Design a protein around this motif. Structure first.
Motif, PDB file in Angstrom:
ATOM      1  N   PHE A 123       0.820  -1.208   0.000  1.00 13.22           N
ATOM      2  CA  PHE A 123       0.000   0.000   0.000  1.00 13.22           C
ATOM      3  C   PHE A 123       0.855   1.260   0.000  1.00 13.22           C
ATOM      4  O   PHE A 123       0.402   2.311  -0.469  1.00 13.22           O
ATOM      5  N   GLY A 124       2.075   1.181   0.535  1.00 17.79           N
ATOM      6  CA  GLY A 124       2.931   2.354   0.571  1.00 17.79           C
ATOM      7  C   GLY A 124       3.342   2.816  -0.812  1.00 17.79           C
ATOM      8  O   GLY A 124       3.455   4.018  -1.068  1.00 17.79           O
ATOM      9  N   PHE A 145      -0.109   4.661  -2.102  1.00 19.10           N
ATOM     10  CA  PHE A 145      -0.503   5.900  -1.435  1.00 19.10           C
ATOM     11  C   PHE A 145       0.618   6.929  -1.419  1.00 19.10           C
ATOM     12  O   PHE A 145       0.349   8.134  -1.437  1.00 19.10           O
ATOM     13  N   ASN A 146       1.872   6.484  -1.380  1.00 20.47           N
ATOM     14  CA  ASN A 146       3.004   7.387  -1.219  1.00 20.47           C
ATOM     15  C   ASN A 146       3.839   7.514  -2.487  1.00 20.47           C
ATOM     16  O   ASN A 146       4.995   7.945  -2.420  1.00 20.47           O
ATOM     17  N   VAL A 158      -2.917   1.242   9.070  1.00 18.34           N
ATOM     18  CA  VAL A 158      -2.091   2.347   8.594  1.00 18.34           C
ATOM     19  C   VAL A 158      -2.951   3.362   7.852  1.00 18.34           C
ATOM     20  O   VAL A 158      -2.688   4.571   7.902  1.00 18.34           O
ATOM     21  N   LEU A 159      -4.005   2.899   7.184  1.00 16.58           N
ATOM     22  CA  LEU A 159      -4.879   3.798   6.432  1.00 16.58           C
ATOM     23  C   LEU A 159      -5.878   4.495   7.352  1.00 16.58           C
ATOM     24  O   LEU A 159      -5.830   5.717   7.527  1.00 16.58           O
TER      25      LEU A 159
HETATM   26  C1  LIG Z   1       3.103   7.050   3.651  1.00 13.84           C
HETATM   27  O1  LIG Z   1       4.162   7.785   4.273  1.00 13.84           O
HETATM   28  C2  LIG Z   1       3.863   8.234   5.601  1.00 13.84           C
HETATM   29  C3  LIG Z   1       5.021   9.101   6.039  1.00 13.84           C
HETATM   30  O2  LIG Z   1       4.977  10.382   5.423  1.00 13.84           O
HETATM   31  C4  LIG Z   1       3.645   7.022   6.498  1.00 13.84           C
HETATM   32  O3  LIG Z   1       3.314   7.461   7.811  1.00 13.84           O
HETATM   33  C5  LIG Z   1       3.814   6.972   8.994  1.00 13.84           C
HETATM   34  O4  LIG Z   1       3.528   5.573   9.130  1.00 13.84           O
HETATM   35  C6  LIG Z   1       4.086   4.981  10.312  1.00 13.84           C
HETATM   36  C7  LIG Z   1       3.788   3.500  10.244  1.00 13.84           C
HETATM   37  O5  LIG Z   1       3.896   3.008   8.916  1.00 13.84           O
HETATM   38  C8  LIG Z   1       3.498   5.652  11.550  1.00 13.84           C
HETATM   39  O6  LIG Z   1       4.103   5.101  12.714  1.00 13.84           O
HETATM   40  C9  LIG Z   1       3.743   7.154  11.494  1.00 13.84           C
HETATM   41  O7  LIG Z   1       3.090   7.792  12.587  1.00 13.84           O
HETATM   42  C10 LIG Z   1       3.226   7.735  10.180  1.00 13.84           C
HETATM   43  N1  LIG Z   1       3.537   9.154  10.094  1.00 13.84           N
HETATM   44  C11 LIG Z   1       2.730  10.049   9.513  1.00 13.84           C
HETATM   45  C12 LIG Z   1       3.213  11.471   9.518  1.00 13.84           C
HETATM   46  O8  LIG Z   1       1.660   9.727   9.005  1.00 13.84           O
HETATM   47  C13 LIG Z   1       2.523   6.159   5.938  1.00 13.84           C
HETATM   48  O9  LIG Z   1       2.423   4.957   6.693  1.00 13.84           O
HETATM   49  C14 LIG Z   1       2.785   5.797   4.476  1.00 13.84           C
HETATM   50  N2  LIG Z   1       1.640   5.096   3.916  1.00 13.84           N
HETATM   51  C15 LIG Z   1       1.634   3.786   3.659  1.00 13.84           C
HETATM   52  C16 LIG Z   1       0.364   3.235   3.082  1.00 13.84           C
HETATM   53  O10 LIG Z   1       2.608   3.077   3.880  1.00 13.84           O
END
Ligand SMILES: *[C@@H]1O[C@H](CO)[C@@H](O[C@@H]2O[C@H](CO)[C@@H](O)[C@H](O)[C@H]2NC(C)=O)[C@H](O)[C@H]1NC(C)=O
Lengths: 221, 222, 193, 214, 215
Positions: free
Chosen positions: C5-6, C9-10, C34-35
């Protein structure tokens, strides 16, 4: 649109035995794509909000003990409590969320079934402080009976009273699982003083014959 | 985990407007649709409508379309249910409930908001003694009590001996009378043994009218 | 064996809505918390599923479709909607089962006049999950166009005027649509349970 | 040469219904964003309705629930069905082709819809007689309803020097109008001036000769 | 919804001048703006789309500029034919709300021209019907401002006359005006001298045209 009918409206189960509530849908609620019935079971104890027990007809919400199980499909669904416990006394509702508008079942009241227990009958004339009020309230108390069904009729000099009595009943007691009821006859002190014998008669399953408690206006008791 | 907390009890007269609220708190609120459910006294649950706060998409039930307005402010995680002009039939408890999506079961329930709509005015109760019967089983059980009559609005509280006596006590639910006033009774079963020695006082408290009343219940000396 | 998913989404770059991207999530353990627990999303509307009850159910496949539209159009990414985006760019079915997630991306897709596109002319509505990347000159009249642009002969794609000072309705929003396919096949996408 | 020609407008009582047609030539209605835009007398432009090639329809909030846009591809024609009409709906209704980013590039010439309970009335035409150099004469077209009225001079043979004034609404609720012309006074005796007045809502045609006096 | 305003509401400039009209949007709408010209009675004509692109077949003097919140339509050299109301419209709304602006009425300014005044008594045909209309015509004047006072037996009449103005002439940019005094046949027969007094910037003194009833 989609309407749900529960059966039965009330249900008495002994502790440890099985309760079964049925919910029939006016139209099927099975998404064939995901293959899940969009049907939920909620529990509501007196004075508390509803709580989700079961969703998708058969999936248990977290924390919900395994004695609750949902089953069924299409238009016919069942909620089962395998070993009824005192903590399960409540009203249970089915609900469809297949489509808006969401619709609830009528609700099924579930109580503990104990042995038949006759009520103790008491009668209380109006207090003289309330006779100074201008109104008069005769109270008849049925105490600690089971089942809840009980009939209480009012007689004033053997005339049956109609329209001027209200009754109130408690919820099932947590400890002995009995009910208690009060019937209040209200009348103007004018009407009250024109009659002598005030009687409250009670029929209940635990009584061989009707029990009458009466008093004569004025005489000591 | 998410939780909903609703506004407090409401007592209004017919014709007045009203807007009760439901505020969400915790994790995941962005995914939650908030519906409203009415429960009229002694009756079942009625789904009124649902709203998604993120964009205020709203779906009403046919029975409540045009009867109420469901709104939301996303900034404070709050949903609103409002009537423009209340009727006596609107007297009920209203729960807000949350499902994490549409066509989703309601996971999270608020605690409920009680709404009374009546032309009655705040009035404290009159407390009268249900005196125990002079003729009673000498070695058995007697019954006495208090009649808490003509008050508005709900609720009242009743204790016995300022909380000391609880066993054998039944405080009945209130009934709404012809007059729009509530009335209630509390009863205790005691041994006839203690009818002369022990004294019984019922303590009634009606906070809406700020009224405390202690009433001694004694055998009428005829 | 965690689901990617990262990457969806990212992603640093996102597709134009007419050429919308699709990622086929398969054979992995997805954790949706995470979502739904994140605070970065402007919109998170699910249909027929609750994202909190997904983490112990299994599906045969999941699709993550991603693209960029503008804020005023996000409400079109839903079942039973109409508009330029729903009719001519991305169409959800009426029986849609899944989540629509969207967030403001003004800080990433606005510069000082980026180049995201949408289809503006089409003779008929798209079928659900249809992807039309054609660039044929749209014929608005009786005269055939012969691949030349002119009166009643229009290029079918148009550019978003994504400027940082736009109103929020004219600002870019990134959108991920998750849809859940459970055929009668081996279920390969599961929650951590 | 693309044209849009609308029709179906006229007098209609409040609460009544009315169907507007717009025939097209030079574009295909079913392949275009087609819209209705109206203009109340003395006011600006107000978009009413739009229909997409794929069939989607959209309406302004003021006509929602009462108006319905539609089309017929066989007849290459756009339609606006107007129900529960109110006097606020009185306007000229234009049919137009929307290109979305390239604007509303093709328009019809409009069709007029008057919502009123007043009844049709034809006008009476009176002369405005003349009396060195230039002399003016004219025609007074009084007490008609509803708009409009057309006025020519000598069956269209005279256009220079002509001023036909906008109709004014009198306190009676009927319209009145004047059309004048300046001529050389030499031809006051040596040319015959006839004003031709047509009020089609009442199917009235009056030819009035304007000749001098004493 | 986003609001569209325009300024000024009215404008007058001479032939050859450089005219500038402004349209403002409540929020930034990028380039999603169009400019239309509407002659009275006729259908609007699209001048500019995409805030700056000139529509094909539109004279080059029309130009458009701006983006975001502020836009301008510019006529580089005003022509006699260019008098009209100019509307701006916001494009690409969702949900679609083809918001137009209030409009800007552009009038051609020119040198002062005095009106030629004419008066017309009611006809006998109209008097048969019970009403009388006295007409007063002000022909080919500029500017549009003009005071028209009715004098009946030297008494100033008020509240029984209506005015009507033609649109500006396409060539010499002048106006013509009618004032109609309406009264009953009886009221008309109660008096003798009917006069129209005209005050216009181009007249050194008020011009009166009169008649005597039945002469
Ligand atoms: C996309 O990136 C963001 C960072 O910019 C990820 O966010 C963090 O995710 C971790 C766990 O995966 C958490 O512990 C943090 O608190 C999150 N930080 C923020 C600022 O959101 C996010 O997980 C990513 N998306 C995916 C789907 O992986």
């Amino acid at each position: 649109d989609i309407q749900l009918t529960q059966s039965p409206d009330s249900l008495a189960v002994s502790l440890g035995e099985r309760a079964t509530i049925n919910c029939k849908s006016s139209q099927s609620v099975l998404y064939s794509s995901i293959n899940k019935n969009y049907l939920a079971w909620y529990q509501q104890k007196p004075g508390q909000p509803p709580k989700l027990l079961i969703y998708w007809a058969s999936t248990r919400e977290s924390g919900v003990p395994d004695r609750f199980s949902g089953s069924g499909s299409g238009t016919d669904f069942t909620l089962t409590i395998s070993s009824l416990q005192a903590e399960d006394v409540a009203v249970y509702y089915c609900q469809q969320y297949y489509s808006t508008p969401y619709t609830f079942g009528q609700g099924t009241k579930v109580e503990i079934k104990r042995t038949v227990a006759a009520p103790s009958v008491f009668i209380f004339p109006p207090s003289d402080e309330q006779l100074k009020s201008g109104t008069a309230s005769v109270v008849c108390l049925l105490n600690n009976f089971y089942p809840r069904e009980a009939k209480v009729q009012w007689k004033v000099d053997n005339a049956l009273q109609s329209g001027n009595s209200q009754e109130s009943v408690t919820e099932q007691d947590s400890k002995d699982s009995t009910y208690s009821l009060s019937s209040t006859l209200t009348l103007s002190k004018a009407d009250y003083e024109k009659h002598k014998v005030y009687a409250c008669e009670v029929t209940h399953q635990g009584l061989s014959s009707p029990v009458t408690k009466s008093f004569n206006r004025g005489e000591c008791s | 985990q998410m939780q909903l907390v609703q506004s407090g009890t409401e007592v209004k007269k017919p014709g007045e407007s009203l807007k009760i609220s439901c505020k969400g708190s915790g994790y995941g609120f962005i995914t939650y649709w908030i519906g409203w459910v009415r429960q009229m006294p002694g009756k079942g649950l009625e789904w009124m409508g649902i709203i998604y706060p993120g964009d205020s998409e709203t779906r009403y039930s046919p029975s409540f379309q045009g009867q109420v307005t469901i709104s939301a402010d996303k900034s404070i995680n709050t949903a609103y249910l409002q009537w423009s002009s209340l009727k006596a039939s609107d007297t009920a408890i209203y729960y807000c409930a949350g499902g994490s999506g549409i066509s989703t079961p309601m996971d999270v329930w608020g605690q409920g908001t009680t709404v009374t709509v009546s032309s009655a005015s705040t009035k404290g109760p009159s407390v009268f003694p249900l005196a125990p019967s002079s003729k009673s089983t000498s070695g058995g059980t007697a019954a006495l009590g208090c009649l808490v009559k003509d008050y508005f609005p709900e609720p009242v509280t009743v204790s016995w001996n300022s909380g000391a006596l609880t066993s054998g006590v039944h405080t009945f639910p209130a009934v709404l009378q012809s007059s729009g006033l509530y009335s209630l009774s509390s009863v205790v079963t005691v041994p006839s043994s203690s009818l002369g020695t022990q004294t019984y006082i019922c303590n009634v408290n009606h906070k809406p009218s700020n009224t405390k009343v202690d009433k001694k219940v004694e055998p009428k000396s005829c | 064996n965690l689901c990617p998913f990262g990457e969806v989404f990212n992603a640093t770059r996102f597709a134009s809505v007419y050429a919308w991207n699709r990622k086929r999530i398969s054979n992995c353990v997805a954790d949706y918390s995470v979502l739904y627990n994140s605070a970065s999303f402007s919109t998170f509307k699910c249909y027929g599923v609750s994202p909190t009850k997904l983490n112990d159910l299994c599906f045969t496949n999941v699709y993550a479709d991603s693209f960029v539209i503008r804020g005023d159009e996000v409400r079109q990414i839903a079942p039973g909607q109409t508009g330029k985006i729903a009719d001519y760019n991305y169409k959800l079915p009426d029986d849609f089962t899944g989540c629509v997630i969207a967030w403001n991306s003004n800080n990433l897709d606005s510069k000082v006049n980026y180049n995201y596109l949408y289809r503006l002319f089409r003779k008929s509505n798209l079928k659900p999950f249809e992807r039309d990347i054609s660039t044929e000159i749209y014929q608005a009249g009786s005269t055939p166009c012969n691949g030349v642009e002119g009166f009643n002969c229009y290029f079918p794609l148009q550019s978003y005027g994504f400027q940082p000072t736009n109103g929020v309705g004219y600002q870019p929003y990134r959108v991920v649509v998750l849809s859940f396919e459970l055929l009668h096949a081996p279920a390969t996408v599961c929650g951590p349970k």
